[PDB]
Amino acid sequence: IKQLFTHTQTVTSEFIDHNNHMHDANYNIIFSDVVNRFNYSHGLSLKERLFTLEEHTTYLSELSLGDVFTVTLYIYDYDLHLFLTLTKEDGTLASTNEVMMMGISFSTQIAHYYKNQPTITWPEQLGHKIAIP
Amino acid sequence: IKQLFTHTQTVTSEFIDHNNHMHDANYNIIFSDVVNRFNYSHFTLEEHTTYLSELSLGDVFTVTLYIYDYDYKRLHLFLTLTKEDGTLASTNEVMMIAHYYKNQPTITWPEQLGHKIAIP
Numbered sequence: 705i706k707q708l709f710t711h712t713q714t715v716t717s718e719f720i721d722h723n724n725h726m727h728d729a730n731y732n733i734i735f736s737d738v739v740n741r742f743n744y745s746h747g748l749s750l751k752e753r754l755f756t757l758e759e760h761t762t763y764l765s766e767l768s769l770g771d772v773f774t775v776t777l778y779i780y781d782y783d784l785h786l787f788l789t790l791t792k793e794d795g796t797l798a799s800t801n802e803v804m805m806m807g808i809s810f811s812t813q814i815a816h817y818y819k820n821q822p823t824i825t826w827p828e829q830l831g832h833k834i835a836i837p
Numbered sequence: 838i839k840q841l842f843t844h845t846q847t848v849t850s851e852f853i854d855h856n857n858h859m860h861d862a863n864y865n866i867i868f869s870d871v872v873n874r875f876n877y878s879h880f881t882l883e884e885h886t887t888y889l890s891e892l893s894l895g896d897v898f899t900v901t902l903y904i905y906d907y908d909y910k911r912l913h914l915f916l917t918l919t920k921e922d923g924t925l926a927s928t929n930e931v932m933m934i935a936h937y938y939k940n941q942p943t944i945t946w947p948e949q950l951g952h953k954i955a956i957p
């Protein structure tokens with residue numbers, strides 16, 4: 705049995721500013737929120753305790769009013785290096801997040817989550833250097 | 838006379854949830870706002886944020902906008918977030934004017950620009 709931490713929610717009025725699409729930084733709000741949710745449930749509760757060092761975000765598909773989406777969390781690497789996917793109801797990959805944190809027994813919860821997470825092909829968004837072609 | 842598009846702001850408690858420091862996503866909110874403000878007086882495809890020095894309650898910071906590159910239809914921005922002394926606190930490079938580019942001061946791009954996320 706392979707496992708995937710998941711958070712589903714819907715695009716609300718708060719998340720939209722102009723021309724009926726989810727505002728760019730609100731994606732980041734969501735990604736952060738879901739990342740805390742993963743650490744809150746993996747040994748580092750606010751009552752138990754991490755600093756965000758770095759993050760990359762790609763926006764691939766527009767998100768409209770009422771649109772329900774899912775954020776799925778993968779461990780790409782650790783010593784920790786995360787990769788989160790934001791997918792539509794169709795399964796359409798709508799956004800990506802790549803994110804690095806560090807500290808200021810969780811090593812077990814994250815180890816067994818990594819050991820028990822499914823194998824996917826990492827999309828081209830992972831470690832894609834930003835440039836104009 | 839070379840110019841720079843700039844927004845100065847103070848860290849409020851609205852920007853703090855835990856660890857007595859500015860929440861990571863609020864940086865993105867600030868950056869996106871400053872970009873929008875630039876395009877108003879002149880979609881986001883892609884973006885990269887680095888957090889190099891934590892922001893505390895009462896810190897007066899400045900966000901400064903540079904154009905790293907531009908094309909017929911794309912803008913490649915690089916934005917710096919610095920404390921009141923000059924300390925580089927955070928960076929934001931973003932893929933989404935000609936005369937802003939021509940009249941902006943030539944700087945040495947910090948190593949954050951085009952950096953690839955990895956554990957060393």
Ligand SMILES: CC(C)(COP(=O)(O)OP(=O)(O)OC[C@H]1O[C@@H](n2cnc3c(N)ncnc32)[C@H](O)[C@@H]1OP(=O)(O)O)[C@@H](O)C(=O)NCCC(=O)NCCS
Nearest residue numbers: 726727728763764765766767835836837880881882883932
């Ligand atoms: C805009 C959108 C419909 C793309 O449709 P499109 O106009 O047909 O463009 P396509 O990507 O299909 O076509 C490929 C072109 O886009 C360019 N492009 C796509 N992604 C790029 C990136 N990260 N950097 C640079 N160029 C990019 C390709 O290089 C190519 O350019 P070319 O014309 O020089 O060959 C889609 O990307 C989108 O809706 N994204 C969501 C944006 C968003 O919601 N952001 C958050 C809130 S603003």
Ligand SMILES: CC(C)(COP(=O)(O)OP(=O)(O)OC[C@H]1O[C@@H](n2cnc3c(N)ncnc32)[C@H](O)[C@@H]1OP(=O)(O)O)[C@@H](O)C(=O)NCCC(=O)NCCS
Nearest residue numbers: 755756757758804859860861888889890891892955956957
């Ligand atoms: C502790 C703090 C000062 C980090 O800087 P520092 O302690 O001076 O750390 P150093 O530069 O000496 O490097 C520490 C290690 O981090 C590693 N590291 C630093 N940045 C990294 C990155 N972006 N990706 C991967 N690894 C990184 C370095 O390789 C270094 O390796 P080592 O421990 O093997 O020596 C931290 O308080 C900070 O940077 N604050 C900003 C974070 C913040 O406010 N976040 C936003 C909200 S969560």
